[PDB]
CSV table of N, CA and C in Angstrom, one decimal:
chain,number,residue,atom,x,y,z
A,1,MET,N,-15.3,-10.5,-11.1
A,1,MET,CA,-14.8,-9.5,-12.1
A,1,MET,C,-13.2,-9.7,-12.2
A,2,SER,N,-12.5,-8.8,-12.9
A,2,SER,CA,-11.1,-8.9,-13.0
A,2,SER,C,-10.4,-8.4,-11.7
A,3,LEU,N,-9.2,-8.7,-11.5
A,3,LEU,CA,-8.4,-8.1,-10.4
A,3,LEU,C,-8.3,-6.6,-10.5
A,4,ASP,N,-8.2,-6.1,-11.7
A,4,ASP,CA,-8.3,-4.7,-12.0
A,4,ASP,C,-9.6,-4.1,-11.4
A,5,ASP,N,-10.7,-4.7,-11.6
A,5,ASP,CA,-12.0,-4.2,-11.2
A,5,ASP,C,-12.1,-4.2,-9.7
A,6,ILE,N,-11.6,-5.2,-9.1
A,6,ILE,CA,-11.6,-5.3,-7.6
A,6,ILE,C,-10.9,-4.2,-6.9
A,7,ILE,N,-9.6,-3.9,-7.4
A,7,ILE,CA,-8.8,-2.8,-6.9
A,7,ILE,C,-9.4,-1.5,-7.2
A,8,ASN,N,-9.8,-1.3,-8.5
A,8,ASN,CA,-10.3,0.0,-8.9
A,8,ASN,C,-11.6,0.4,-8.1
A,9,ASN,N,-12.4,-0.6,-7.8
A,9,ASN,CA,-13.6,-0.4,-7.1
A,9,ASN,C,-13.3,0.0,-5.7
A,10,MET,N,-12.3,-0.6,-5.1
A,10,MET,CA,-11.8,-0.3,-3.8
A,10,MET,C,-11.3,1.1,-3.7
A,11,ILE,N,-10.6,1.5,-4.8
A,11,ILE,CA,-10.1,2.9,-4.9
A,11,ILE,C,-11.2,3.9,-5.0
A,12,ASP,N,-12.3,3.5,-5.7
A,12,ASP,CA,-13.5,4.4,-5.8
A,12,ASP,C,-14.2,4.6,-4.5
A,13,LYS,N,-14.1,3.6,-3.6
A,13,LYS,CA,-14.8,3.8,-2.3
A,13,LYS,C,-13.9,4.7,-1.4
A,14,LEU,N,-12.6,4.5,-1.5
A,14,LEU,CA,-11.7,5.2,-0.7
A,14,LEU,C,-11.7,6.7,-1.0
A,15,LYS,N,-11.8,7.1,-2.2
A,15,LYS,CA,-12.0,8.4,-2.6
A,15,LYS,C,-13.0,9.2,-1.8
A,16,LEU,N,-14.1,8.5,-1.4
A,16,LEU,CA,-15.3,9.1,-0.8
A,16,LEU,C,-15.3,9.0,0.7
A,17,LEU,N,-14.4,8.2,1.2
A,17,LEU,CA,-14.4,7.8,2.7
A,17,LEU,C,-13.2,8.2,3.5
A,18,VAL,N,-12.1,8.3,2.8
A,18,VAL,CA,-10.8,8.4,3.5
A,18,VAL,C,-9.9,9.4,2.7
A,19,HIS,N,-9.3,10.4,3.5
A,19,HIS,CA,-8.4,11.4,2.9
A,19,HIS,C,-7.1,10.7,2.5
A,20,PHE,N,-6.7,10.9,1.2
A,20,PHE,CA,-5.4,10.4,0.7
A,20,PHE,C,-5.2,11.0,-0.6
A,21,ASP,N,-4.0,11.0,-1.1
A,21,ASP,CA,-3.6,11.6,-2.3
A,21,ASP,C,-3.1,10.5,-3.3
A,22,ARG,N,-2.6,9.4,-2.8
A,22,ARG,CA,-2.0,8.4,-3.7
A,22,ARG,C,-2.1,7.1,-3.1
A,23,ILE,N,-2.4,6.1,-3.9
A,23,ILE,CA,-2.5,4.7,-3.5
A,23,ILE,C,-1.8,3.8,-4.5
A,24,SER,N,-1.1,2.8,-4.0
A,24,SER,CA,-0.6,1.8,-4.9
A,24,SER,C,-0.9,0.5,-4.3
A,25,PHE,N,-1.2,-0.5,-5.1
A,25,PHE,CA,-1.4,-1.8,-4.6
A,25,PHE,C,-0.4,-2.8,-5.2
A,26,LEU,N,0.2,-3.6,-4.4
A,26,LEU,CA,1.2,-4.6,-4.8
A,26,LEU,C,0.8,-6.0,-4.6
A,27,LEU,N,1.1,-6.9,-5.5
A,27,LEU,CA,0.6,-8.2,-5.5
A,27,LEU,C,1.8,-9.2,-5.2
A,28,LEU,N,1.6,-10.1,-4.3
A,28,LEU,CA,2.5,-11.1,-4.1
A,28,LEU,C,2.1,-12.4,-4.8
A,29,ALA,N,2.9,-12.8,-5.8
A,29,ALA,CA,2.8,-14.1,-6.4
A,29,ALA,C,4.2,-14.7,-6.5
A,30,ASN,N,4.3,-16.0,-6.2
A,30,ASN,CA,5.6,-16.7,-6.2
A,30,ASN,C,6.7,-16.2,-5.4
A,31,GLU,N,6.3,-15.7,-4.2
A,31,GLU,CA,7.3,-15.1,-3.2
A,31,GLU,C,7.9,-13.8,-3.8
A,32,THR,N,7.3,-13.2,-4.8
A,32,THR,CA,7.8,-12.0,-5.5
A,32,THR,C,6.7,-11.0,-5.4
A,33,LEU,N,7.0,-9.8,-4.9
A,33,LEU,CA,6.1,-8.7,-4.7
A,33,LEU,C,6.3,-7.7,-5.9
A,34,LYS,N,5.2,-7.4,-6.6
A,34,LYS,CA,5.2,-6.6,-7.7
A,34,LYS,C,4.2,-5.4,-7.7
A,35,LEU,N,4.6,-4.2,-8.0
A,35,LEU,CA,3.7,-3.1,-8.2
A,35,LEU,C,2.6,-3.5,-9.2
A,36,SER,N,1.4,-3.4,-8.9
A,36,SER,CA,0.4,-3.8,-9.9
A,36,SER,C,-0.7,-2.8,-10.2
A,37,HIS,N,-1.0,-1.9,-9.3
A,37,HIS,CA,-2.0,-0.8,-9.5
A,37,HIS,C,-1.6,0.4,-8.8
A,38,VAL,N,-1.8,1.6,-9.5
A,38,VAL,CA,-1.6,2.9,-8.9
A,38,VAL,C,-2.7,3.8,-9.2
A,39,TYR,N,-3.1,4.6,-8.2
A,39,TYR,CA,-4.0,5.7,-8.4
A,39,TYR,C,-3.4,7.0,-7.7
A,40,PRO,N,-3.4,8.1,-8.4
A,40,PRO,CA,-3.9,8.4,-9.8
A,40,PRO,C,-3.1,7.7,-10.8
A,41,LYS,N,-3.7,7.4,-12.0
A,41,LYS,CA,-3.2,6.5,-13.0
A,41,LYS,C,-1.7,6.8,-13.4
A,42,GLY,N,-1.4,8.1,-13.5
A,42,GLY,CA,-0.1,8.6,-14.0
A,42,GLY,C,1.0,8.4,-13.0
A,43,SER,N,0.7,8.3,-11.7
A,43,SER,CA,1.7,8.6,-10.6
A,43,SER,C,2.4,7.4,-10.0
A,44,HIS,N,3.5,7.0,-10.7
A,44,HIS,CA,4.4,6.1,-10.2
A,44,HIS,C,5.8,6.4,-10.8
A,45,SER,N,6.9,6.2,-10.1
A,45,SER,CA,8.2,6.3,-10.6
A,45,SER,C,8.6,4.9,-11.1
A,46,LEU,N,8.2,3.9,-10.5
A,46,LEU,CA,8.5,2.5,-10.9
A,46,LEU,C,7.4,2.1,-11.9
A,47,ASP,N,7.8,1.4,-12.9
A,47,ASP,CA,6.9,0.8,-13.9
A,47,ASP,C,6.0,-0.1,-13.2
A,48,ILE,N,4.7,-0.2,-13.7
A,48,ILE,CA,3.8,-1.3,-13.3
A,48,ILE,C,4.6,-2.6,-13.6
A,49,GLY,N,4.5,-3.5,-12.7
A,49,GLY,CA,5.2,-4.8,-12.8
A,49,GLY,C,6.6,-4.9,-12.2
A,50,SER,N,7.1,-3.7,-11.7
A,50,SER,CA,8.4,-3.7,-11.0
A,50,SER,C,8.4,-4.7,-9.8
A,51,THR,N,9.5,-5.3,-9.5
A,51,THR,CA,9.7,-6.2,-8.4
A,51,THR,C,10.3,-5.4,-7.2
A,52,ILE,N,9.7,-5.5,-6.0
A,52,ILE,CA,10.2,-4.9,-4.8
A,52,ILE,C,11.1,-5.9,-4.1
A,53,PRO,N,12.4,-5.6,-4.0
A,53,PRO,CA,13.4,-6.4,-3.3
A,53,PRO,C,13.1,-6.3,-1.8
A,54,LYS,N,13.5,-7.4,-1.1
A,54,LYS,CA,13.3,-7.5,0.3
A,54,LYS,C,14.2,-6.6,1.1
A,55,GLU,N,15.5,-6.4,0.7
A,55,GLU,CA,16.5,-5.7,1.5
A,55,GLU,C,16.0,-4.2,1.6
A,56,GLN,N,16.0,-3.8,2.9
A,56,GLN,CA,15.6,-2.4,3.2
A,56,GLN,C,14.2,-2.0,2.8
A,57,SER,N,13.4,-3.0,2.6
A,57,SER,CA,12.0,-2.7,2.0
A,57,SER,C,11.0,-2.5,3.1
A,58,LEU,N,10.3,-1.3,3.1
A,58,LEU,CA,9.2,-1.0,4.0
A,58,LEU,C,8.1,-1.9,3.8
A,59,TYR,N,7.7,-2.1,2.5
A,59,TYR,CA,6.6,-3.0,2.1
A,59,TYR,C,6.8,-4.5,2.6
A,60,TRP,N,8.0,-5.0,2.4
A,60,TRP,CA,8.3,-6.4,2.9
A,60,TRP,C,8.3,-6.4,4.4
A,61,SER,N,8.7,-5.3,5.1
A,61,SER,CA,8.7,-5.3,6.5
A,61,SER,C,7.3,-5.4,7.1
A,62,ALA,N,6.3,-4.8,6.4
A,62,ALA,CA,4.9,-4.9,6.8
A,62,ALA,C,4.4,-6.3,6.6
A,63,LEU,N,4.8,-6.9,5.5
A,63,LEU,CA,4.4,-8.3,5.2
A,63,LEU,C,5.1,-9.3,6.2
A,64,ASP,N,6.4,-9.1,6.5
A,64,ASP,CA,7.1,-10.0,7.4
A,64,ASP,C,6.5,-9.9,8.8
A,65,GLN,N,6.3,-8.7,9.3
A,65,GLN,CA,5.8,-8.4,10.6
A,65,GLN,C,4.3,-8.7,10.8
A,66,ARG,N,3.6,-8.8,9.7
A,66,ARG,CA,2.2,-8.9,9.7
A,66,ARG,C,1.5,-7.8,10.4
A,67,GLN,N,2.0,-6.6,10.2
A,67,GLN,CA,1.6,-5.4,10.9
A,67,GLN,C,1.5,-4.2,10.0
A,68,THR,N,0.5,-3.3,10.3
A,68,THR,CA,0.4,-2.0,9.6
A,68,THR,C,1.6,-1.1,10.0
A,69,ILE,N,2.3,-0.5,9.1
A,69,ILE,CA,3.4,0.4,9.4
A,69,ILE,C,3.1,1.8,8.9
A,70,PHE,N,3.3,2.7,9.7
A,70,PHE,CA,3.3,4.1,9.3
A,70,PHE,C,4.7,4.7,9.3
A,71,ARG,N,5.0,5.5,8.3
A,71,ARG,CA,6.2,6.2,8.2
A,71,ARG,C,6.1,7.6,7.6
A,72,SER,N,6.6,8.5,8.4
A,72,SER,CA,6.9,9.9,7.9
A,72,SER,C,8.0,9.8,6.9
A,73,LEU,N,7.8,10.6,5.8
A,73,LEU,CA,8.8,10.6,4.7
A,73,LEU,C,9.8,11.7,4.9
A,74,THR,N,9.7,12.4,6.0
A,74,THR,CA,10.5,13.6,6.2
A,74,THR,C,11.7,13.4,7.1
A,75,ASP,N,11.7,12.2,7.8
A,75,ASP,CA,12.9,11.8,8.6
A,75,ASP,C,14.1,11.6,7.7
A,76,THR,N,14.9,12.6,7.7
A,76,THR,CA,16.2,12.6,6.9
A,76,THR,C,17.1,11.4,7.3
A,77,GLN,N,16.9,10.9,8.5
A,77,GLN,CA,17.8,9.7,9.0
A,77,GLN,C,17.1,8.3,8.8
A,78,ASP,N,16.1,8.3,8.0
A,78,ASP,CA,15.3,7.0,7.8
A,78,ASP,C,15.2,6.8,6.3
A,79,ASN,N,16.0,5.9,5.8
A,79,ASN,CA,15.9,5.5,4.4
A,79,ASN,C,15.3,4.0,4.3
A,80,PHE,N,14.6,3.8,3.1
A,80,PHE,CA,14.2,2.5,2.8
A,80,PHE,C,14.0,2.4,1.3
A,81,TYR,N,13.9,1.2,0.7
A,81,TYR,CA,14.0,1.0,-0.7
A,81,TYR,C,12.9,1.9,-1.4
A,82,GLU,N,11.7,1.9,-0.8
A,82,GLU,CA,10.6,2.6,-1.5
A,82,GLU,C,10.6,4.1,-1.4
A,83,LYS,N,11.4,4.6,-0.5
A,83,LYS,CA,11.4,6.0,-0.1
A,83,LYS,C,11.6,7.0,-1.3
A,84,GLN,N,12.7,6.9,-2.0
A,84,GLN,CA,12.9,7.9,-3.1
A,84,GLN,C,11.8,7.8,-4.2
A,85,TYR,N,11.1,6.7,-4.3
A,85,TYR,CA,10.1,6.5,-5.3
A,85,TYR,C,8.8,7.1,-4.9
A,86,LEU,N,8.6,7.2,-3.5
A,86,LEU,CA,7.5,7.9,-3.0
A,86,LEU,C,7.7,9.4,-2.8
A,87,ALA,N,8.9,9.8,-2.3
A,87,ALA,CA,9.1,11.2,-2.1
A,87,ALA,C,9.0,12.0,-3.4
A,88,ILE,N,9.4,11.4,-4.5
A,88,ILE,CA,9.4,12.0,-5.8
A,88,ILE,C,8.0,12.4,-6.3
A,89,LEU,N,7.0,11.7,-5.7
A,89,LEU,CA,5.6,12.0,-6.0
A,89,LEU,C,5.0,13.0,-5.0
A,90,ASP,N,5.9,13.8,-4.4
A,90,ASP,CA,5.5,14.8,-3.3
A,90,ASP,C,4.8,14.2,-2.1
A,91,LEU,N,5.0,13.0,-1.8
A,91,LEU,CA,4.3,12.4,-0.6
A,91,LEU,C,5.2,12.7,0.6
A,92,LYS,N,4.5,12.9,1.7
A,92,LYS,CA,5.2,13.2,3.0
A,92,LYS,C,5.0,12.2,4.1
A,93,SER,N,4.2,11.2,3.7
A,93,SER,CA,3.7,10.3,4.7
A,93,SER,C,3.2,9.0,4.0
A,94,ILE,N,3.5,7.8,4.5
A,94,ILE,CA,3.1,6.6,3.9
A,94,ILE,C,2.5,5.6,5.0
A,95,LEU,N,1.3,5.1,4.7
A,95,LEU,CA,0.7,4.0,5.5
A,95,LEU,C,0.7,2.8,4.6
A,96,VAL,N,1.3,1.7,5.2
A,96,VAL,CA,1.5,0.5,4.5
A,96,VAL,C,0.7,-0.6,5.2
A,97,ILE,N,-0.3,-1.1,4.5
A,97,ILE,CA,-1.1,-2.2,5.0
A,97,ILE,C,-0.8,-3.5,4.3
A,98,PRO,N,-0.2,-4.5,5.0
A,98,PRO,CA,0.0,-5.8,4.3
A,98,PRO,C,-1.4,-6.4,4.2
A,99,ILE,N,-1.6,-7.0,3.0
A,99,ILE,CA,-2.9,-7.7,2.7
A,99,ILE,C,-2.7,-9.2,2.9
A,100,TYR,N,-3.3,-9.8,3.9
A,100,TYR,CA,-3.3,-11.2,4.0
A,100,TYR,C,-4.6,-11.9,4.3
A,101,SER,N,-4.8,-13.1,3.8
A,101,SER,CA,-6.0,-13.9,4.1
A,101,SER,C,-5.7,-14.9,5.2
A,102,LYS,N,-6.6,-15.7,5.5
A,102,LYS,CA,-6.4,-16.8,6.5
A,102,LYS,C,-5.4,-17.8,6.0
A,103,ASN,N,-5.1,-17.9,4.7
A,103,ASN,CA,-4.2,-18.9,4.2
A,103,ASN,C,-2.8,-18.3,3.9
A,104,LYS,N,-2.7,-17.1,3.3
A,104,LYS,CA,-1.5,-16.6,2.8
A,104,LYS,C,-1.4,-15.1,2.7
A,105,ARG,N,-0.2,-14.6,2.6
A,105,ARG,CA,0.0,-13.2,2.2
A,105,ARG,C,-0.4,-13.0,0.8
A,106,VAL,N,-1.0,-11.9,0.5
A,106,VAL,CA,-1.6,-11.6,-0.8
A,106,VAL,C,-1.0,-10.4,-1.4
A,107,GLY,N,-0.6,-9.4,-0.6
A,107,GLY,CA,0.0,-8.2,-1.2
A,107,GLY,C,0.1,-7.1,-0.2
A,108,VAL,N,0.3,-5.9,-0.7
A,108,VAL,CA,0.5,-4.7,0.1
A,108,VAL,C,-0.4,-3.5,-0.4
A,109,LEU,N,-1.0,-2.8,0.5
A,109,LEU,CA,-1.6,-1.5,0.2
A,109,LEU,C,-0.8,-0.4,0.7
A,110,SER,N,-0.5,0.6,-0.1
A,110,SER,CA,0.4,1.7,0.3
A,110,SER,C,-0.4,3.0,0.1
A,111,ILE,N,-0.6,3.7,1.2
A,111,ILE,CA,-1.5,4.9,1.1
A,111,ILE,C,-0.7,6.1,1.5
A,112,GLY,N,-0.6,7.1,0.5
A,112,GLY,CA,0.2,8.2,0.7
A,112,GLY,C,-0.6,9.5,0.9
A,113,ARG,N,0.0,10.4,1.7
A,113,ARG,CA,-0.5,11.8,1.8
A,113,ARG,C,0.5,12.8,1.5
A,114,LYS,N,0.2,13.8,0.8
A,114,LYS,CA,1.1,15.0,0.5
A,114,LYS,C,1.3,15.9,1.7
A,115,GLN,N,0.3,16.0,2.5
A,115,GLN,CA,0.4,16.8,3.8
A,115,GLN,C,0.5,15.8,4.9
A,116,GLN,N,1.3,16.2,5.9
A,116,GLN,CA,1.5,15.3,7.1
A,116,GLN,C,0.4,15.4,8.1
A,117,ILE,N,-0.7,14.7,7.8
A,117,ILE,CA,-1.9,14.8,8.7
A,117,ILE,C,-2.0,13.4,9.3
A,118,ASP,N,-2.1,13.3,10.6
A,118,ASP,CA,-2.2,12.0,11.3
A,118,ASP,C,-3.4,11.2,10.8
A,119,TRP,N,-3.2,9.8,10.8
A,119,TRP,CA,-4.2,8.9,10.6
A,119,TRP,C,-5.0,8.7,11.9
A,120,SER,N,-6.3,8.9,11.8
A,120,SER,CA,-7.2,8.7,13.0
A,120,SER,C,-7.4,7.2,13.2
A,121,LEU,N,-7.9,6.8,14.4
A,121,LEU,CA,-8.2,5.5,14.7
A,121,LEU,C,-9.4,5.0,13.9
A,122,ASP,N,-10.4,5.8,13.7
A,122,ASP,CA,-11.5,5.5,12.9
A,122,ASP,C,-11.1,5.1,11.4
A,123,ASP,N,-10.2,5.9,10.8
A,123,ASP,CA,-9.8,5.6,9.5
A,123,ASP,C,-9.0,4.3,9.4
A,124,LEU,N,-8.1,4.1,10.4
A,124,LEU,CA,-7.3,2.9,10.4
A,124,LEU,C,-8.1,1.6,10.7
A,125,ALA,N,-9.1,1.7,11.6
A,125,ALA,CA,-10.0,0.6,11.8
A,125,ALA,C,-10.8,0.3,10.6
A,126,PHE,N,-11.3,1.3,9.9
A,126,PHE,CA,-12.1,1.1,8.7
A,126,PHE,C,-11.2,0.5,7.6
A,127,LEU,N,-10.0,1.0,7.3
A,127,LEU,CA,-9.1,0.5,6.3
A,127,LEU,C,-8.8,-1.0,6.5
A,128,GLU,N,-8.5,-1.3,7.8
A,128,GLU,CA,-8.1,-2.7,8.1
A,128,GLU,C,-9.2,-3.7,7.8
A,129,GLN,N,-10.4,-3.3,8.1
A,129,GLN,CA,-11.6,-4.2,7.9
A,129,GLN,C,-11.8,-4.3,6.4
A,130,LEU,N,-11.7,-3.2,5.7
A,130,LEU,CA,-11.8,-3.1,4.2
A,130,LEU,C,-10.8,-3.9,3.5
A,131,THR,N,-9.5,-3.9,4.0
A,131,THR,CA,-8.4,-4.6,3.3
A,131,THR,C,-8.4,-6.1,3.7
A,132,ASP,N,-9.0,-6.4,4.9
A,132,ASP,CA,-9.2,-7.8,5.2
A,132,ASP,C,-10.2,-8.5,4.3
A,133,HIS,N,-11.3,-7.8,3.9
A,133,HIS,CA,-12.2,-8.4,3.0
A,133,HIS,C,-11.6,-8.4,1.6
A,134,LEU,N,-10.7,-7.5,1.3
A,134,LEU,CA,-10.0,-7.4,0.0
A,134,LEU,C,-9.2,-8.6,-0.2
A,135,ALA,N,-8.5,-9.1,0.8
A,135,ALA,CA,-7.6,-10.3,0.7
A,135,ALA,C,-8.4,-11.5,0.4
A,136,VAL,N,-9.6,-11.6,1.0
A,136,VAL,CA,-10.5,-12.8,0.6
A,136,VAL,C,-10.9,-12.7,-0.9
A,137,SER,N,-11.4,-11.5,-1.3
A,137,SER,CA,-11.8,-11.3,-2.7
A,137,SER,C,-10.8,-11.6,-3.7
A,138,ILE,N,-9.5,-11.2,-3.4
A,138,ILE,CA,-8.4,-11.4,-4.3
A,138,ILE,C,-8.1,-12.8,-4.4
A,139,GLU,N,-8.1,-13.5,-3.3
A,139,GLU,CA,-7.7,-14.9,-3.2
A,139,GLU,C,-8.7,-15.7,-3.9
A,140,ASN,N,-10.0,-15.3,-3.9
A,140,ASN,CA,-11.1,-16.0,-4.6
A,140,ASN,C,-11.2,-15.7,-6.1
A,141,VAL,N,-10.3,-15.0,-6.6
A,141,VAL,CA,-10.1,-14.8,-8.0
A,141,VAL,C,-9.3,-16.0,-8.6
A,142,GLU,N,-8.2,-16.3,-7.9
A,142,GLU,CA,-7.2,-17.3,-8.3
A,142,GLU,C,-7.4,-18.6,-7.5
């Protein structure tokens, strides 16, 4: 199907399985990371297609480290490029999962909560497995 359908379908499953308020998906093409999908449809401060710069970027930090990063958005002493654009959507918490396949980095999944409720191990294990398959599926489109 389209890349749209792959992401939207993923979002449809998450709605039923995992507590969250906002998700965005970002796509890496040509060493450039771009916002490409947001749920709920209305909720972004950055236009679809915006480029995320590397400097001070939480999303690039996850990609560079090849690690899932969790950040509370209430730490007044912690700024990053994405922060103001997330806080404005009333989010208090962000989970950033870098999406990679066996060959390459593919993108980033950003999962927001309005209430600061810890991520359980079960949810994190489930998301990681789900996003690891997602990377294969996205790669096999192009």
